[PDB]
């Protein structure tokens, strides 16, 4: 390999560089942007079936608990930080840290239900 190495080696180097620079913004999902939204659909059924069972379960103690359990079900690690704002109620953003660059944000009273809605829409 001559051209293939020139591609793969710089892929590795630059991906590591961007990961260390930003901890995100690294696109290595391998899907076209016209169809990158199919990322959550193309997981193994093992995670998907139990995650959708959890998100469809109504007995959950609270919306936050449901969100955390669903997110842990897909093995996706959370990352929640406080965005500066003029609102008295804190404006919190959540980063999922998965290969698919995804970020959600709202009031902390709604961020969990927002995560519920997002993963309800995507996981099919």
């Amino acid at each position: 390999e001559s051209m293939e190495e020139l591609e793969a080696l710089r892929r590795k180097k630059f991906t590591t560089y961007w990961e260390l620079k930003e901890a995100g913004s690294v696109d290595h999902t391998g899907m076209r942007l016209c169809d990158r939204h199919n990322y959550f659909k193309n997981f193994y059924p093992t995670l998907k079936k139990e995650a959708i069972e959890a998100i469809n379960s109504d007995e959950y103690e609270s919306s936050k608990d449901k969100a955390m359990d669903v997110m842990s079900s897909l093995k996706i690690t959370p990352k929640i930080s406080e965005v500066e704002s003029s609102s008295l109620v804190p404006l919190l953003s959540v980063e999922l840290n998965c290969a698919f660059d995804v970020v959600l944000m709202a009031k902390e009273t709604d961020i969990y239900d927002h995560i519920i809605d997002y993963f309800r829409t995507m996981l099919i």
Binding site: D58, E59, E61, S62, D65, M68
Partner: protein, 345 residues
């Protein structure tokens, strides 16, 4: 009225300085002065069932709390509230309990407990919140109440001195498990507990202990071929490290709602049968234990709504008295000292 200056700004609004009722002004109890305590009672209207016993029986417990003021309160009406289990009735004692504060440290203990309730139990706290002693507006106090000798009721001094702050839950490791004493079923009965291993650090009330059930026993449903201990390891082995006190008793715990404003009837398909079938069983040494009794926590949870409703009922009473005195109708038995408030319709 003839001016054209304010024709354009028709639909504007204005800011106004709120003021407390006169009773809640300079209500801070003082050393060497007589102060009055009004017990707050709660009566559940919903039936006690698998979805409702933990709230019904706990609310009907004789242990309550009271509101403490220098200023005598007038009579107040019966009050409805709407919990998840169903409708709830609230009243204020017509006969105040009267005591005297004799030293500064006792008042400091009272104020510390009052601050602790909001800071930790209700989590109404803000970083900029500060306790006040100016005896200015909105300076009444809250005191827990414990039954005294016979029919008398008195202050729960030991509870206040024990809980100047809530203890932070922590995750003890295997060596810490071994050095700690064995769990006791009576020390858990009716107490507030929380799990220190998972992200769920929120408290819960254990309905009752299950001394007859021990790890390695098969579970209740679905995974009936599986045992409690094996599932606990498979779930949280990397969190807990290891289990000590293998053969000890288990507990059954139910969750505490986060709601604070119970004015409007929340409604939905609660699926009482399925919500009861999700019987939560936990290992005692895996969950931190608060000495705080739940028979007071499930009544402190309703405190903010009751306090706000009383704040406004006092203004309603003041206006009623002002008008009935102005029209010279106050001397009537309907509006006189025999004024019997009617429950809010």
């Amino acid at each position: 009225v003839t001016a054209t200056v304010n024709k354009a700004d028709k639909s504007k609004d204005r800011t106004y300085k709120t003021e407390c009722p006169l009773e809640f002004y300079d209500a801070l109890p003082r050393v060497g002065e007589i102060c009055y305590a009004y017990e707050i009672f709660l009566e559940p209207q919903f039936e006690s069932c698998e979805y409702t016993e933990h709230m019904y029986l706990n609310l009907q417990t004789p242990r309550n709390y009271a509101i403490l003021l220098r200023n005598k309160l007038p009579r107040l009406a019966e009050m409805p509230l709407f919990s998840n289990q169903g409708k709830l009735h609230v009243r204020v004692a017509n006969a105040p309990l009267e005591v005297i504060i004799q030293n500064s440290e006792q008042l400091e203990l009272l104020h510390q407990f009052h601050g602790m309730v909001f800071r930790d139990i209700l989590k109404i706290w803000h970083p900029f919140f500060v306790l006040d002693r100016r005896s200015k507006e909105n300076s009444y106090l809250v005191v827990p109440l414990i039954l005294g000798a016979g029919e008398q009721k008195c202050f729960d001094w030991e509870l206040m001195t024990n809980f100047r702050r809530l203890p932070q839950s922590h995750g003890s490791n295997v060596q810490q498990r071994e050095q700690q004493p064995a769990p006791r079923p009576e020390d858990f009965e009716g107490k507030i507990v929380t799990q220190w291993y998972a992200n769920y650090d929120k408290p819960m009330l254990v309905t009752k202990v299950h001394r007859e059930l021990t790890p390695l026993s098969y579970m209740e449903k679905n995974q009936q071929d599986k045992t409690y201990y094996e599932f606990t390891m498979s779930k949280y082995g990397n969190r807990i490290g290891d289990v000590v006190h293998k053969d000890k008793f288990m507990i059954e715990v139910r969750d505490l709602t986060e709601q604070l404003t119970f004015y409007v009837h929340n409604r939905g398909k609660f699926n009482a049968k399925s919500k009861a079938k999700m019987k939560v069983i936990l290992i005692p040494e895996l969950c931190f234990n608060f000495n705080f009794p739940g028979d007071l926590w499930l009544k402190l949870i309703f405190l903010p709504s009751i306090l706000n409703r009383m704040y406004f009922l006092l203004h309603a009473e003041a206006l009623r008295k002002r008008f009935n005195t102005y029209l010279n109708l106050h001397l009537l038995p309907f509006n006189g000292t025999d004024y019997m408030p009617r429950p809010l319709e």
